[model samples]
Target: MGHHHHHHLDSYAPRAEAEKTFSYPLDLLLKLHDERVLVAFGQRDGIRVGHAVLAINGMDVNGRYTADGKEVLEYLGNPANYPVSIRFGRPRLTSN
Candidate 1:
């Protein structure tokens, strides 16, 4: 048998340039709003607001594997190739 642990975002802050960016990230954020269900948003101990969550419990979020036994994440353009490329599964603040 296994013990199941589930978690939710303790806090969430909306996008900065709503009127400018036209609420760009809001669509995804809204989906997670008001205690909605999202499987990828599961939690692990010691995970923080900005900490990189490469994997959970030594496994990919959905157990997907590559031929070389690694998960590859790709970004399309310059904006996507910033300092970090991982999604926290939680809330984050930005300067926009």
Candidate 2:
């Protein structure tokens, strides 16, 4: 899993200004908001900030301990890329 921080609301950030090009080998973004939260189905004290929490923490799809390996993740939220995944895991097979 891979993670990157973003410190701005998606709406307020101007598309033109945000469109500026830059290069950074490493950068961080922390949501500039309070408690970053969500509410759905009329329930209060709702869901966690977002799903990136998993990738940010370097966990697998199951949200448990991470394997000692690097990973690359791509956004699949698009209808075109929907239902995409692979089967892989850790504690890698050891040779006797």
Candidate 3:
């Protein structure tokens, strides 16, 4: 039997360029119902302002939400500048 060689594919082409059809990144929002929830989520997921804004999808600025529940939009608007302590609930991982 003869062995077959495979060629690797490179470069990406826009499916529907020059329009809104192109994929774009989105800004995330951390749903903060309370203060404690914010800190706890940050501590568990290591989600800071910079960390949450990672452009994995391509910097569209419209996409939102980190892999974790932390919200990038909310962080941008408010960063918890003042010192306030509140206990947060232990967030359970949803996905494997």
- Separately for all candidates shown, the number of backbone clashes (residues 3 or more apart, or on different chains) is 0, 1, 14
The residue-by-residue lDDT of candidate 3 on 1-96, one tens digit each, is 889785433332212112122111323223443222222133435533222222222332223443454353453344352221221123321111
Poorest stretch of ten by lDDT in candidate 3: 15-24
Off by over 4 Å in 1: 1-31, 34-41, 46-86
Q: After superposition, how far is residue 83 of candidate 2 from its true place, in Å?
A: 1.7
Give the per-residue lDDT of model 1 (tens digit) for 1-96.
699887544344443221112112222211122222122322354332232222222232222222244432322112333232232333333211
Candidate 2 per-residue C-alpha lDDT over 28-52 given as tens digits, one digit per residue, 9 for 90 to 100? 1212112211111222343322212
lDDT for model 1, on a 0 to 1 scale? 0.28
Best-first order by TM-score: 3, 2, 1
User: Which residue segments of model 3 deviate by more than 4 Å?
Assistant: 1-62, 81-96
Error of 1 at 83 (Å): 22
Ranking by lDDT: 3, 1, 2
Deviation of model 1 at 73, angstroms: 18
